[PDB]
From a paper:
Tga-[name] has an extension of 11 or 19 residues at the N-terminus compared to Pae-[name] or Pab-[name], respectively. This non-structured part of the protein was cleaved between residues R8-I9 by trypsin and the first residue that could be located without ambiguity in the electron density map was Y11 (Trypsin was used to remove the His-Tag because the internal proteolytic site between the Tag and the N-terminus of Tga-[name] is thrombin resistant). Another part of Tga-[name] appears to be more flexible than in Pab- and Pae-[name]. In the two molecules present in the asymmetric unit, residues between L236 and G240 were not clearly visible and were not assigned due to high mobility. In fact, the mean b-factor for the N/C domain (43 Å2) is almost twice as high as that observed for the HhH domain (23 Å2). This observation could be related to the absence of a disulfide bridge between the two cysteine residues present in Tga-[name] (C32 and C250, hypothetical S/S in Supplementary Figure S5A), despite the fact that they are close to each other in the 3D structure (3.54 Å). Despite differences in the number of disulphide bridges, Tga-[name] adopts the same conformation as Pab- or Pae-[name] with minor differences located mainly in the N/C domain. Under the same conditions, the oxidized and reduced forms of Tga-[name] are indistinguishable in terms of their activity (at least up to 80°C), indicating that this enzyme, like Pab-[name], does not rely on disulphide bridges and instead achieves heat resistance by means that are insensitive to a reducing agent. The sequence alignment based on 3D structures unambiguously shows that the catalytic lysine is strictly conserved in AGOGs and corresponds to K142 and K162 of Pab-[name] and Tga-[name], respectively.
Residue numbers in the entry: 11 to 236, 242 to 263
């Protein structure tokens, strides 16, 4: 493949300097979705219900009628005020009446109906196992349940959000698996072409191995590269390194 080795070498070193510490700070302090999850977890006081709601919610988080951060806050406030029991019934009222996710409701409710027989029986012990030692397994099982490709964008997003939910519920950071490849993203794809003609999944897999940053955490870092005020206020002097990534 045609590669700009010098630019790739700089990219790797900048990502090494940011590291998992920066990715985690972006996920928890820059991404307002994380605080939305903290609010819901505190208000429900039922970590099994909280985590299952996050997975189901992520599986319907496509073609939104608003910004992602607004949607996750609407979800958090709605289920804090109207805590659910029957998840299909709850979403049947929530989605068409929401501001930020009222499009394609029929297909979204079918997806909730499809996932609930898998999520409902899970115990907190099994959920802990998925979080601490099984996020790749969860991705594969969700894809099977949903009759979706293993790399399907919304399946992978559900695992990403599950990682946030577990970090909150279990008070421990577990990095995303190296095996979950870089998400398929129009902005990432255009950025990759600055460095190589190689397909991004292969390229970012090597970058992940060379930096020790799993691809889903690289994706977190690339979000502000590709909000900026919130980053400068939380990553400290490492915020300039984010600006270095955009200008590569
Ligand atoms: Cl999907």
């Amino acid at each position: 493949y045609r590669e700009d080795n010098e630019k790739v070498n700089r990219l790797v070193e900048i990502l090494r300097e940011l590291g998992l510490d920066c990715a985690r700070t972006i996920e928890e302090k820059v991404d307002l979705q994380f605080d939305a999850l903290r609010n819901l977890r505190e208000n429900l006081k039922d970590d099994e219900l909280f985590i299952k709601l996050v997975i189901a919610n992520a599986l319907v988080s496509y073609q939104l009628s608003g910004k992602g951060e607004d949607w996750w806050w609407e979800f958090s406030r709605y289920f804090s005020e109207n805590p659910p029991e029957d998840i299909v019934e709850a979403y049947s009222s929530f989605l068409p009446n929401s501001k930020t996710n009222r499009r394609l409701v029929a297909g979204k409710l079918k997806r909730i109906e499809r996932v609930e027989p898998f999520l409902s029986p899970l115990s907190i012990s099994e959920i802990r196992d998925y979080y601490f030692n099984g996020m790749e397994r969860l991705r594969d099982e969700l894809a099977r349940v949903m009759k979706a490709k293993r790399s399907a964008k919304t399946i992978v997003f559900a695992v990403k959000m599950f990682g946030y939910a577990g970090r909150i519920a279990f008070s421990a950071f577990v990095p995303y698996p190296m095996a979950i490849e870089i998400p398929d993203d129009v902005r990432i794809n255009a950025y990759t072409k600055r460095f190589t003609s190689e397909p991004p999944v292969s390229f970012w897999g090597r970058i992940a191995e060379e930096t020790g940053i799993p691809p889903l955490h690289i994706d977190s870092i690339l979000w502000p590269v590709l909000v900026l005020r919130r980053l400068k206020k939380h990553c400290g002097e490492k915020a300039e390194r984010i600006l270095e990534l955009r200008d590569l």
